[PDB]
């Protein structure tokens, strides 16, 4: 099955998922000089006050912090979005070294990691239906750089020892995702796709300009996770990022001057 290795990695995905070579694939390089300020963008609204986390899962590709999305609570609205998008999960992509790990790049700069907060358009009723629509999902992308520790990340870091291997999960209630946001909500936006198979072209990407800082010790604990299951040979969960894909007929818009 698909993964991030030499024999099952991003360069192989097109054989089982031909949309890998499509017209709106993600991630992309964000050319900051070409991106144009868009005055038609409305104010972005991230309303996570009532977010209700449930569980954390190692799925063999990353780990997901899952939310109860059965009521209208943690919502993303405004910016490029029409209507309301509900938070369902977040996860990260990261590197084996501090010099790589992000999926999006900024003037070809790779960050140490990238946080994806995944939301579905409530007009489609649930996330499984939403992902089949061109405006079905909105992913808020946040870059991570190595420096000062992120206090709001530490509860995630400390539970990772309990979900080391593929298929392990743990209770993860009362986690506040507001502790993972930077100060500024300045962003770039473009139409794209899931960055993992099935690579569906159903995502509005909103990538924040300001990275968050995490400590070397925090990211080192991400790198102790395993792609493999319990009782299988250890394959460290590192470099679980897809490289930048062709921009093709797309414009990246900036929320800021
Ligand atoms: N990397 S990314 O583009 O943000 C990316 C984002 C999302 C998914 N897939 C899912 O969320 C699958 N899923 C559901 O539909 C409901 C729960 C769940 O885990 C895959 C990739
Ligand atoms: Zn992702």
UniProtKB/Swiss-Prot annotation:
Domain Alpha-carbonic anhydrase: from-to ranges: 1-256
Subcellular location: Cytoplasm; Cell membrane
Obligatory cofactor(s): Zn(2+); Co(2+)
UniProt GO BP: angiotensin-activated signaling pathway; carbon dioxide transport; morphogenesis of an epithelium; neuron cellular homeostasis; positive regulation of cellular pH reduction; positive regulation of dipeptide transmembrane transport; positive regulation of synaptic transmission, GABAergic; regulation of chloride transport
Documented effect of changing residue 118 to K/R: Strongly reduced CO(2) hydrase and p-nitrophenyl acetate esterase activities
Active site positions: 61 (proton donor/acceptor)
Residues modified as Phosphoserine: 162, 169
Mutagenesis / variant outcome for changing residue 59 to A: Reduced activity
Outcome of substituting residue 64 to Q: 2-fold decrease in enzyme efficiency, as determined by kcat/KM ratio, and efficiently inhibited by chlorzolamide
EC number: 4.2.1.1, 4.2.1.69
Effect annotated for changing residue 196 to H: Higher affinity for bicarbonate. Enhanced proton transfer capacity
Free-text activity regulation comment from the record: Activated by X-ray, histamine, L-adrenaline, L- and D-phenylalanine, L- and D-histidine, L-His-OMe and beta-Ala-His (carnosine).
Outcome when changing residue 61 to G: Impaired activity, not rescued by 4-methylimidazole (4-MI)
InterPro entries for the chain: CA_dom, CA_dom_sf, Carbonic_anhydrase_a-class, Carbonic_anhydrase_a-class_CS
Effect on the protein upon substituting residue 198 to A: Normal CO(2) hydrase activity, but impaired stability
Effect of residue 103 to A/Q: Strongly reduced CO(2) hydrase activity
Effect on the protein upon substituting residue 4 to H: Reduced proton transfer rate
Entry's disease: Osteopetrosis, autosomal recessive 3: A rare genetic disease characterized by abnormally dense bone, due to defective resorption of immature bone. Osteopetrosis occurs in two forms: a severe autosomal recessive form occurring in utero, infancy, or childhood, and a benign autosomal dominant form occurring in adolescence or adulthood. Recessive osteopetrosis commonly manifests in early infancy with macrocephaly, feeding difficulties, evolving blindness and deafness, bone marrow failure, severe anemia, and hepatosplenomegaly.
PANTHER family the record matches: CARBONIC ANHYDRASE, CARBONIC ANHYDRASE 2
Role: Catalyzes the reversible hydration of carbon dioxide. Can also hydrate cyanamide to urea. Stimulates the chloride-bicarbonate exchange activity of SLC26A6. Essential for bone resorption and osteoclast differentiation. Involved in the regulation of fluid secretion into the anterior chamber of the eye. Contributes to intracellular pH regulation in the duodenal upper villous epithelium during proton-coupled peptide absorption.
Protein name: Carbonic anhydrase 2
Organism: Homo sapiens
Gene: CA2
């Amino acid at each position: 099955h698909w993964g991030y290795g030499k024999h099952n990695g991003p360069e192989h995905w097109h054989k089982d998922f031909p949309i890998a070579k499509g017209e709106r694939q993600s991630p992309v390089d964000i050319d900051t000089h070409t991106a144009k300020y868009d005055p038609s963008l409305k104010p972005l609204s991230v309303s996570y006050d009532q977010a209700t986390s449930l569980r954390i899962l190692n799925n063999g590709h990353a780990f997901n912090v899952e939310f109860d999305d059965s009521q209208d609570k943690a919502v993303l609205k405004g910016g490029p979005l029409d209507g309301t998008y509900r938070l369902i999960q977040f996860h990260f992509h990261w590197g084996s070294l501090d010099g790589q790990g992000s999926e999006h790049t900024v003037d070809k700069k790779k960050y140490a990691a990238e946080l994806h907060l995944v939301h579905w358009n409530t007009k489609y009723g649930d996330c499984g239906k939403a992902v089949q629509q061109p405006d079905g999902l909105a992913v808020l992308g946040i870059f991570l750089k190595v420096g000062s520790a992120k206090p709001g990340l530490q509860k995630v870091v400390d539970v990772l020892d309990s979900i080391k291997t593929k298929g392990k999960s743990a209770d993860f209630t009362n986690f506040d995702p507001r502790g993972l946001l930077p100060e500024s909500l300045d962003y770039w936006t473009y139409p794209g796709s899931l960055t993992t198979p099935p690579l569906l072209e159903s995502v509005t990407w909103i990538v924040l300009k300001e990275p968050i800082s995490v400590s070397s010790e925090q990211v080192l604990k991400f790198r102790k996770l395993n792609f493999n299951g319990e009782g299988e040979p250890e394959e460290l969960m590192v470099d679980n990022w897809r490289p930048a894909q062709p921009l093709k007929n797309r414009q990246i818009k900036a929320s800021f001057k």
